[PDB]
Design a binder for this molecule. Structure first.
Ligand SMILES: Nc1ncnc2c1ncn2[C@@H]1O[C@H](COP(=O)(O)OP(=O)(O)OP(=O)(O)OP(=O)(O)OP(=O)(O)OC[C@H]2O[C@@H](n3cnc4c(N)ncnc43)[C@H](O)[C@@H]2O)[C@@H](O)[C@H]1O
Ligand SMILES: [Mg+2]
Lengths: 164, 171
């Protein structure tokens, strides 16, 4: 599968109204001045795919992800996957996952327009070979994680890829 | 036995990929993946041994930031070639690399994008130039917004960024 677009509402620096962010099936480059909000788009992806670590998304707690210019009633991200390849074990050409977090720290999830649990979301993503923290997601300043990891951690990554 | 067999097929594929890709990204250099315990791999780790200039290994700890990044990138792409992930998200992975090296990385991304989606945040023209689509981010009155950008517009934006002291990640 691949990401067709994100929809952000009340998410970090993106304001109170719904922001649509489309991607090429191939190679999309994201450019913009220092501090303009680029990495926050990556954080939207971590968030909607079930990220439980506020710190990974540079927040003290998950509610800190809610837009406050100097706030929103909650933060929400929707991610739209093209699933024509049936990578997701769902008989639909589109798989839409949505996560909303409230000021009290609780999250609601939707899968294809129906309420879902976190584990339900995680399981479908795992089946599709996608996770908030896979080797395929390289956050700012973290490319050398692959050379910093122990030889043992490095082999375990290959265990995973091999499917064993 | 059976798990060992699946592992070894995967390992040899990724190992060969890694060596080829490292040599591509660093012309004149070479690198290898090594199982700490080839007899029972599951009893040991997986090491990287690199010769950035082709003769003489350079220990990881003695590598420059650029050397570390290239080594890590060769590894990520070695996996990608064997088993393309649905998407990759790379945030300023070109820090500490000169234009020559960033171009080689960008070329590898372009080729790999036939099989996986790549989303790359970058301040580098030589990274951006052949992207299929460009998203522009800007902040006004504390709020971020995105637009779609043409290459000509994106280039002007990067020109303005490169003019300011310390634009690069890590400053
Ligand atoms: N709830 C909310 N409501 C409203 N607004 C919200 C919000 N949550 C977040 N925001 C806003 O989102 C904006 C940031 O968006 P963000 O998406 O992080 O902006 P960016 O375009 O990715 O900016 P840069 O990568 O250039 O980071 P920077 O140099 O500006 O960062 P810093 O000075 O800290 O850099 C420090 C050093 O570390 C490096 N660095 C920068 N970012 C990272 C990172 N993500 N990981 C590791 N190192 C980093 C830099 O190069 C530098 O060396 C901020 O204005 C923030 O207030
Ligand atoms: Mg950033």
């Amino acid at each position: 599968p691949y990401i067709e677009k994100l929809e952000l509402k009340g998410f970090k620096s993106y304001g109170n109204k719904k922001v649509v962010i489309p991607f090429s099936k191939g190679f999309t480059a994201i450019v913009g001045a220092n501090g303009s909000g680029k990495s926050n788009i990556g954080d939207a992806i971590l968030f909607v795919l079930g990220g439980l670590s506020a710190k990974a998304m540079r927040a003290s707690r998950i509610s800190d992800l809610i837009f406050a210019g100097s706030p929103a009633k909650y933060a929400e991200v929707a991610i739209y996957f093209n699933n024509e390849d049936r990578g997701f074990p769902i008989d639909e050409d589109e798989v839409v996952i949505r996560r909303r977090v409230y000021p009290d720290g609780r999250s609601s999830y939707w899968l294809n327009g129906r309420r879902a649990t976190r584990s339900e979301i995680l399981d479908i993503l795992t089946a599709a070979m996608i996770s908030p923290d896979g080797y395929n997601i390289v956050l700012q300043g973290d490319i050398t994680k692959f050379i910093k990891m122990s030889p043992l951690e490095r082999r375990l990554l290959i265990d995973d890829i091999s499917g064993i | 036995k059976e798990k060992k067999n699946v592992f070894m097929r995967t390992f040899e594929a990724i190992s060969r990929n890694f060596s080829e890709i490292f040599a591509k990204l660093s012309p004149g250099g070479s690198a290898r993946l090594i199982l700490e315990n080839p007899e029972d791999p599951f009893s040991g780790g997986l090491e990287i041994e690199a010769k950035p200039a082709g003769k003489d290994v350079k220990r990881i700890e003695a590598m420059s930031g650029g050397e570390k990044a290239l080594t890590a990138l060769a590894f990520v792409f070695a996996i990608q070639k064997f088993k393309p992930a649905p998407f990759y998200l790379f945030d300023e992975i070109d820090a500490h690399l000169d234009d020559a090296n960033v171009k080689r990385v960008a070329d590898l991304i372009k080729e790999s994008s036939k099989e996986s989606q790549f989303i790359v945040i970058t301040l580098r023209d030589v990274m951006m130039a052949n992207a299929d689509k460009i998203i522009g981010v800007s902040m006004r009155d504390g709020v971020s917004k995105v637009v779609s950008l043409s290459l000509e517009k994106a280039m002007k934006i990067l020109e303005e960024i490169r003019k300011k002291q310390g634009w690069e990640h890590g400053n």
